Scaffold this motif. Structure first.
Motif, mmCIF file in Angstrom:
data_model
loop_
_atom_site.group_PDB
_atom_site.id
_atom_site.type_symbol
_atom_site.label_atom_id
_atom_site.label_comp_id
_atom_site.label_asym_id
_atom_site.label_seq_id
_atom_site.Cartn_x
_atom_site.Cartn_y
_atom_site.Cartn_z
ATOM 1 N N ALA A 77 -6.482 6.317 -14.217
ATOM 2 C CA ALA A 77 -5.251 6.185 -13.469
ATOM 3 C C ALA A 77 -4.102 6.523 -14.393
ATOM 4 C CB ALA A 77 -5.108 4.738 -13.005
ATOM 5 N N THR A 78 -2.897 6.516 -13.844
ATOM 6 C CA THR A 78 -1.742 6.721 -14.682
ATOM 7 C C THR A 78 -1.279 5.297 -14.962
ATOM 8 O OG1 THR A 78 -1.062 8.866 -13.835
ATOM 9 C CG2 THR A 78 0.637 7.469 -14.813
ATOM 10 N N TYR A 79 -1.030 5.009 -16.234
ATOM 11 C CA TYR A 79 -0.592 3.685 -16.654
ATOM 12 C C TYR A 79 0.888 3.636 -16.950
ATOM 13 C CZ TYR A 79 -5.365 2.164 -16.625
ATOM 14 O OH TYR A 79 -6.602 1.801 -16.142
ATOM 15 N N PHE A 80 1.566 2.658 -16.360
ATOM 16 C CA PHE A 80 2.998 2.503 -16.577
ATOM 17 C C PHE A 80 3.363 1.174 -17.177
ATOM 18 C CE2 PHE A 80 4.337 6.000 -13.934
ATOM 19 C CZ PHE A 80 3.466 6.021 -12.857
ATOM 20 N N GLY B 171 0.778 -1.229 0.000
ATOM 21 C CA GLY B 171 0.000 0.000 0.000
ATOM 22 C C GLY B 171 0.810 1.280 0.000
ATOM 23 N N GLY B 172 2.102 1.160 0.294
ATOM 24 C CA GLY B 172 2.990 2.309 0.317
ATOM 25 C C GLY B 172 3.117 2.973 1.672
ATOM 26 N N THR B 173 4.243 3.640 1.899
ATOM 27 C CA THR B 173 4.426 4.393 3.126
ATOM 28 C C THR B 173 5.023 5.717 2.705
ATOM 29 O OG1 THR B 173 6.489 4.499 4.443
ATOM 30 C CG2 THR B 173 5.704 2.344 3.756
ATOM 31 N N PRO C 211 -5.178 8.277 -9.173
ATOM 32 C CA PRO C 211 -4.651 9.449 -8.462
ATOM 33 C C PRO C 211 -4.734 9.360 -6.935
ATOM 34 C CG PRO C 211 -6.533 10.036 -9.870
ATOM 35 C CD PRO C 211 -6.223 8.604 -10.153
ATOM 36 N N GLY C 212 -3.592 9.607 -6.294
ATOM 37 C CA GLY C 212 -3.494 9.558 -4.844
ATOM 38 C C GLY C 212 -3.551 8.148 -4.286
ATOM 39 N N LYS C 213 -3.457 7.158 -5.163
ATOM 40 C CA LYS C 213 -3.549 5.780 -4.725
ATOM 41 C C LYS C 213 -2.283 4.968 -4.890
ATOM 42 C CE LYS C 213 -7.342 4.139 -4.673
ATOM 43 N NZ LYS C 213 -8.305 4.209 -5.803
ATOM 44 N N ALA C 214 -2.379 3.703 -4.507
ATOM 45 C CA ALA C 214 -1.257 2.795 -4.595
ATOM 46 C C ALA C 214 -1.100 2.191 -5.984
ATOM 47 C CB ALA C 214 -1.416 1.680 -3.572
#
Lengths: 214, 222, 11
Positions: free
Chosen positions: B93-96, A100-102, B43-46
């Motif tokens: 979302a942003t795609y990579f 989930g990230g930190t 956006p703003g997510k994991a």
């Protein structure tokens, strides 16, 4: 499927600090784990591969250890460009799970938010919609929580909030929460309340107004 | 040097099919054990893993998305394509796309599999928004009562929108919040500024949404 | 839980 939990989810530190981040897996992933750093607006950048191997070009202050289900990333001496979000990735099982990230932000003194509530403008009311906004200005740390109340009824599913990036001089965050109602529903009530919970407040601060009360 | 770059449409409508392309250089999808995968980020997510394809044409997909995803490579054009059918707003979302090393070899013999445990080179990423919405300028509303005030920039599309105060002269104590994509497919955001309750000086929000050529100056008072 | 192994888990 596999769960990859990062701890902590958020972390405050200062330049020069030694920080450690962890990633636990619900099942053994052997040494197939990677760490990445992601600065806002950019793609994640690889730091550690195969649980402990330092990726080429990556500064030696980054180190990774562990195997199986417990992994940790440590940055021996925090540099300014390390304030970012970190992720861990598992590649022992498909699908290749991400944690989930930190988030690692600049630490500063606890600062409670200045709270303000704005009622909808008459100009908007004419359009048939009513937007009520709550502002939490310059607070720290980043975690906060807004609860809307209308004549003491708890609002849910009808608000949206957004947060600013940490301020480069304040090291604070600001949050906006917009409660959205139809004009009809807005005019069926009087007390509009924004309740705010933050670590910098002994208790929750509530800001409110009485609609139509002139 | 390895480089990847995502290309595709910045906007797509719900129910539609989104086709993304990863153009790379510095490696071949004919090289042993090499892979190219797709990862997305709301956006703003994991980060969320989508799929991967290898130079031997082996493919894997995220199980919660495998009925809408197709990954394919074109070895000769150094490209990998990802098709996502029947998209919805949660797909914005942003795609990579990213590279995955194959095993290290010594005289054409795999000797180290450690380097495969990571996605080592990533593309910059492409932003994809899903909305059934058409170009639309914002409605600017006053946010009126240290004192706080602002301008609510509502119902526009697409991004972005610029907002300044007093024509660029008010910078201190200004907070322009990131826009939120409303259920309606239109964006909305607020710009607020904090000032000495004494000052109430005039305050006006200069709002410009180029996509629609909508320019608005709104003065805000107590 | 029953996960499929990665391409290189059995190399």
């Amino acid at each position: 499927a596999l769960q990859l939990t990062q701890s902590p989810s958020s972390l405050s530190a200062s330049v020069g600090d030694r920080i450690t981040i962890t990633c636990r897996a619900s099942q053994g992933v052997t040494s197939a784990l990677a760490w990445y750093r992601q600065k806002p607006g950019s793609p994640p950048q690889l730091l550690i591969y195969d649980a402990s191997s330092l990726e080429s070009g990556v500064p030696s202050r980054f180190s990774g250890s562990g195997s199986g289900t417990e992994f940790t990333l440590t940055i021996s001496t925090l540099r300014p460009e390390d304030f970012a979000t970190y992720y861990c990735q598992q590649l022992h099982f498909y699908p290749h799970t991400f944690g989930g990230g930190t988030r690692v932000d600049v630490r500063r003194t606890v600062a409670a938010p200045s709270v303000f509530i704005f009622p909808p403008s008459d100009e908007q009311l004419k359009s048939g919609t009513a937007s009520v906004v709550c502002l939490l200005n310059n607070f720290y740390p980043r975690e906060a929580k807004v609860q809307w109340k209308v004549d003491n009824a708890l609002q849910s599913g009808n608000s949206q909030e957004s947060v600013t990036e940490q301020d480069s001089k304040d090291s604070t965050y600001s949050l906006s929460s917009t409660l959205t109602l139809s004009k009809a529903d807005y005019e069926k009530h009087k007390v509009y309340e924004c309740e705010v919970t933050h670590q910098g407040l002994s208790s929750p601060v509530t800001k409110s107004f009485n609609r139509g009360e002139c | 040097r390895i480089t990847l770059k995502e290309s595709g449409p910045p906007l797509v409508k719900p129910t539609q099919t989104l086709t993304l392309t990863c153009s790379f250089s510095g490696f071949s999808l004919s090289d042993f054990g090499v892979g190219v995968g797709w990862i997305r980020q709301p956006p703003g997510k994991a980060l969320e893993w989508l799929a991967i394809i290898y130079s031997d044409d082996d493919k894997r997909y995220s199980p919660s998305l495998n009925t809408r995803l197709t990954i394919t490579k074109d070895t000769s054009k150094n490209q990998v394509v990802l098709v996502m059918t029947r998209v919805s707003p949660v797909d914005t979302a942003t795609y990579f796309c990213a590279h995955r090393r194959g095993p290290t070899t010594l005289f054409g013999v795999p000797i180290a599999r450690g380097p495969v445990n990571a996605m080592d080179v990533w593309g910059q990423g492409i932003t994809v928004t899903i909305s059934s919405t058409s170009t639309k300028g914002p409605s600017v509303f006053p946010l009126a009562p240290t004192a706080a005030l602002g301008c609510l920039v509502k119902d526009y599309f697409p991004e972005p929108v610029t907002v300044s105060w007093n024509s660029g002269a008010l910078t201190s104590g200004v907070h322009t919040f990131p826009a939120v994509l409303q259920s309606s497919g239109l964006y909305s955001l607020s710009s607020v500024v904090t000032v000495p309750s004494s000052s109430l000086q005039t305050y006006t929000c200069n709002v410009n949404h180029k996509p629609s050529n909508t320019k608005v100056d709104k003065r805000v008072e107590p | 839980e029953l996960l499929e192994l990665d391409k290189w888990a059995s190399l």
